[PDB]
Write a protein that binds this ligand. Sequence first.
Ligand SMILES: O=C(Nc1nccs1)[C@H](CC1CCCCC1)n1ccc(S(=O)(=O)C2CCCC2)cc1=O
Ligand SMILES: OC[C@H]1O[C@H](O)[C@H](O)[C@@H](O)[C@@H]1O
Length: 420
Amino acid sequence: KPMPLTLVEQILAEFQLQEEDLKKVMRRMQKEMDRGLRLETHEEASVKMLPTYVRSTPEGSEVGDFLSLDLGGTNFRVMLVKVGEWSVKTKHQMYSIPEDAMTGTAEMLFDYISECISDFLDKHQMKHKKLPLGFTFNNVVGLLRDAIKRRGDFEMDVVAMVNDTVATMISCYYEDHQCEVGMIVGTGCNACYMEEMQNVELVEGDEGRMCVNTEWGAFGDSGELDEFLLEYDRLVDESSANPGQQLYEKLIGGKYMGELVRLVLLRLVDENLLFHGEASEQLRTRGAFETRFVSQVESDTGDRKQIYNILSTLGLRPSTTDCDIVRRACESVSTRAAHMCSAGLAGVINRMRESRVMRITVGVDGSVYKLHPSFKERFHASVRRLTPSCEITFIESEEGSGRGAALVSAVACKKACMLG
Ligand SMILES: O=C(Nc1nccs1)[C@H](CC1CCCCC1)n1ccc(S(=O)(=O)C2CCCC2)cc1=O
Ligand SMILES: OC[C@H]1O[C@H](O)[C@H](O)[C@@H](O)[C@@H]1O
């Protein structure tokens, strides 16, 4: 690797977070999580710590058979699941989303999904059963319900979905029974974890554990992050749909990562350190630097082809130095995101540790975590540094055979049943 530019590195150094900084964010997160959990403070808490009603014990035992509907991009799976004494047996069919039912209404698409569900039920002689249906991957539940009603020929309880963090935890638990945390680092960022029932003040009872959905993206409301915000973060915040809100998620999620990078590049441009002080019109356009471009730049093999390709698409004619500066800018933003995210997770893991040496599996999903080079590794290394006396295993949500997803639907249907 070459000797970096001093003046560029001084700007990029703004993004560094020291261990003392990360510990400070973590402690602050821990106090907000405490507020969220307590009856007295829950309403005013910015970090809601929502009880998910997913308990550490097998509940809703009368739910034996159910439908699982896995909705993807251009198709969907209809799966019949039987749960026994767990013995998760599945059968399924794949269906293709109609090619024209992407011009017409959301309502017409669900009539088609309904029809496929009916076909599956006919095939396995299950049309009469009043099966619950769990959805895997917001108001799709409402749309499916309406479309089944619209049909009348079979009866069904489309159950509430679980939050994506909870689905991540559950599906990962299927492959590793030590999984007690689910985390998403995608467009948004959130975590759920198995909390001691005594600490879940919003639910009566002291026995076992319940999954708590932190909704930690809202952290930062009270200025918990203000000392870590850079100019780019303030600009992103001011231009967002919700200024002053979701400050934490704004530092981490893919929704704004590309925008952060874009703003860094324009700073460098204006300091005459990049593109010889000349930005293109696409670069000057809000949202033009896509988050995927950050991972693409970071994927560059060393030849600068991927970077040149991205930057040329933005109407730039970058030198090799320009390409290298953009890379480092993408890395600084990504690394800062991984560090901020690690302080949140460390906060959860440390709290869990008090509440009992601790071995724990963390289930993780999301485009940023899965697809950004070195995000996950920097994230792991940082989390581990902040959690001494914890051994943390990280696993990804991987579709496999659809059994983790069957389990998600099982739990969601059982929870619904348990909740009347
Ligand atoms: O069903 C559950 N919880 C529910 N709340 C409400 C309705 S249903 C939980 C959810 C998990 C708990 C821990 C983290 C991930 C999810 N659940 C799911 C499978 C098994 S199990 O069947 O694997 C068992 C049988 C032998 C040992 C474990 C045990 C269990 O408690
Ligand atoms: O998708 C990750 C997360 O994005 C946003 O933070 C949503 O509020 C949250 O519920 C979800 O878990």
